[PDB]
Amino acid sequence: FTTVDNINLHTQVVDMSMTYGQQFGPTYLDGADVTKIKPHNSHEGKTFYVLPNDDTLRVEAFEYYHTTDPSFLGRYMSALNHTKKWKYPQVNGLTSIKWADNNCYLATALLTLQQIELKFNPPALQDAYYRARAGEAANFCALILAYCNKTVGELGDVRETMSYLFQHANLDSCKRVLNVVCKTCGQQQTTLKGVEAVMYMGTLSYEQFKKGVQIPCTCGKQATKYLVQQESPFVMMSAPPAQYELKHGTFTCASEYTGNYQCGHYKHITSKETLYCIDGALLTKSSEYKGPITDVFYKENSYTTTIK
Numbered sequence: 001f002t003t004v005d006n007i008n009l010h011t012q013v014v015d016m017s018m019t020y021g022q023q024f025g026p027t028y029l030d031g032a033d034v035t036k037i038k039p040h041n042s043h044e045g046k047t048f049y050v051l052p053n054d055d056t057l058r059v060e061a062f063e064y065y066h067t068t069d070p071s072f073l074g075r076y077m078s079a080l081n082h083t084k085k086w087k088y089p090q091v092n093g094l095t096s097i098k099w100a101d102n103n104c105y106l107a108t109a110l111l112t113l114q115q116i117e118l119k120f121n122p123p124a125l126q127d128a129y130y131r132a133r134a135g136e137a138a139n140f141c142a143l144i145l146a147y148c149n150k151t152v153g154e155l156g157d158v159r160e161t162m163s164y165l166f167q168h169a170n171l172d173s174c175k176r177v178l179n180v181v182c183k184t185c186g187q188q189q190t191t192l193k194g195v196e197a198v199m200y201m202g203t204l205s206y207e208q209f210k211k212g213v214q215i216p217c218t219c220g221k222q223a224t225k226y227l228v229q230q231e232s233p234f235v236m237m238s239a240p241p242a243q244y245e246l247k248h249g250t251f252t253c254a255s256e257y258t259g260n261y262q263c264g265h266y267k268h269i270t271s272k273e274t275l276y277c278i279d280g281a282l283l284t285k286s287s288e289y290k291g292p293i294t295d296v297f298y299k300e301n302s303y304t305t306t307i308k
């Protein structure tokens with residue numbers, strides 16, 4: 001049969017005698033590009049993916065992936081063909097990835113997602129992610145790449161990745177309320193719902209954000225932003241990478257990034273019965289940790305401030 005999602009099969013195949021070179025639009029047996037080949041006896045009955053190019057396919061594809069972008073399922077299949085060949089060790093019970101093709105950012109992403117409460121909207125993500133959590137994460141990875149519109153081998157940012165991915169989860173009952181106090185301009189409160197309710201960029205410390213954090217006011221001058229209320233299952237605090245101390249028990253996990261713009265390397269840190277650094281397939285444990293951190297994730301429930 002022919003498919004776009006592998007749940008819905010259309011045996012509009014030529015199963016017993018084709019032999020015009022895969023005149024089915026682009027085709028893909030098990031994620032290998034087979035567009036330009038005539039069929040090999042032992043094919044009849046296996047399932048080939050094809051690009052959604054009639055009204056009926058474009059629907060099922062949209063319902064499954066939650067985009068209609070045509071190049072999507074191409075870029076997906078492209079990436080799958082590589083990520084199928086990466087290895088996915090469990091480390092301390094989490095699915096990670098053996099380094100290949102600058103995949104460090106994807107490893108870190110993957111590791112964080114297994115540690116954070118999300119529900120993805122597109123069935124494809126929900127599906128893929130279950131498999132990932134279970135150890136076989138080639139699809140999940142291929143999808144993530146297609147969704148962020150990056151190709152295997154191209155360098156990636158973990159914050160940018162999560163950001164895209166959160167576009168596709170159910171965060172709508174997530175709420176953040178901020179107050180900005182200016183000496184001359186007085187106060188100014190702000191409510192954020194959805195993705196922007198869970199992400200801050202400028203400080204790593206959640207404590208510091210509750211205590212208050214100096215920012216330039218819109219008049220130019222000296223103000224304090226603080227978190228008045230938070231309702232979400234986690235928060236993600238980010239900044240440009242800087243030497244930072246992670247203390248046990250006080251965050252859930254974090255991504256560090258050492259290197260520079262052209263060459264660098266992400267590792268994942270997670271606070272358990274000790275601090276575990278997971279660096280693709282590698283694992284080390286220490287009681288201290290200081291290092292160039294870029295993103296920290298905290299478990300949240302509901303928080304309200306007590307600042308008068």
Ligand SMILES: Nc1ccc2cc3ccc(N)cc3nc2c1
Pocket residue numbers: 157158201239240241257294
């Ligand atoms: N992995 C990396 C590496 C360098 C980075 C430099 C940055 C500078 C400004 C900003 N707002 C975010 C950044 N994030 C980075 C993330």
Ligand SMILES: Nc1ccc2cc3ccc(N)cc3nc2c1
Pocket residue numbers: 105155156157158260261262264
């Ligand atoms: N893997 C990498 C390497 C360099 C990077 C440099 C950055 C500069 C600004 C920004 N906002 C994000 C960045 N992310 C990076 C991610």
Ligand SMILES: Nc1ccc2cc3ccc(N)cc3nc2c1
Pocket residue numbers: 099258259260263264265
């Ligand atoms: N300071 C640095 C700079 C670049 C780096 C590039 C890497 C690539 C793969 C890998 N497994 C580890 C790396 N560590 C780096 C450490």
Ligand SMILES: [Zn+2]
Pocket residue numbers: 182183184185186217218219220221222
């Ligand atoms: Zn002001």
